[PDB]
């Protein structure tokens, strides 16, 4: 009776609140993945810029060294790391998809 | 009978575990926001440092070239990018808020 | 009857919640992994930038010493003031793993 009506009301409430939180969680992890993508892009681009600067400086120094060795009678280690978050972002995508699969559809 | 009582007990258990997990989620997303802000700060600061190094070398190389040319005649290829996560962090805040207003307050019995 | 439906609906609720719970644990764990990786990469590249700046400083110093020697210039910071910022997310990662711990402790084991 009224215990059953109250139990059904509570079931509906739990379902609504859980689905709302589920949408919120989906959104949060999707934004986290997009932010990780942008972070990877920025970090890798700045690492490429640093490597390009080092290589350009080395090339110019070599050219100057050739010019100097011409007036004489002579013959003639920076490590940049690239960021790789591909697998982690794929796992995050699968997490978001499981959250998709976790929607609650009550029997009326 | 006992089945209705067990169902009410299980409802209470479900709501309690859900609210616990909800608080946990909120803390995790707030922490993700903090970490993303710190990452943005560090990345942009080191990008500005790289840009300053590049421009410094450019100015000095130009000065030396000008001297050699004064006796001889009568680095924008390095481009750094900045990090912007403001929209992502704001939507993370909104996620935390929607999680906040999702707590379950069950009708007792 | 509606009582049978209530029971099976409760089971469905608990199962979908535990599914989502595992999903969130995985999500925050991989977020922690990604944050550790970005910290490592950012700090390594900051060290690389600093090393480039310092080696350029020393090389330019030797060259200026030679030029001053040929000029008999007697007197002996900018590129040595290029200071990088290193990333420290330790507190955030610890908070994240304790969040994953609480999510572990939030699993639903229904009574029959």
UniProtKB/Swiss-Prot annotation, chain C:
- Region (Heptad repeat 1) spans which residues? 10-60
What is the native source organism of this protein? Bat coronavirus HKU4
Q: What is this protein called?
A: Spike protein S2'
Superkingdom, taxonomy of origin = Viruses
* Coiled-coil spans in chain: 39-75
What this chain does, per the record?
Acts as a viral fusion peptide which is unmasked following S2 cleavage occurring upon virus endocytosis.
């Amino acid at each position: 009776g009224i215990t059953q009506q109250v139990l059904a009301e509570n079931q509906k409430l739990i379902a609504n609140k859980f689905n709302q939180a589920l949408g919120a969680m989906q959104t949060g992890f999707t934004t986290s993945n997009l932010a990780f993508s942008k972070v990877q892009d920025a970090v890798n681009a700045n690492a490429n810029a640093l490597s390009k600067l080092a290589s350009e400086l080395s090339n110019t120094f070599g050219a100057i060294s050739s010019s100097i060795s011409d007036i004489l009678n002579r013959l003639d280690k920076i490590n940049t790391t690239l960021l790789d978050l591909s697998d982690e972002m794929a796992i995050l995508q699968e997490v978001v998809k499981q959250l998709n699969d976790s929607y609650i559809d009550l029997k009326e």
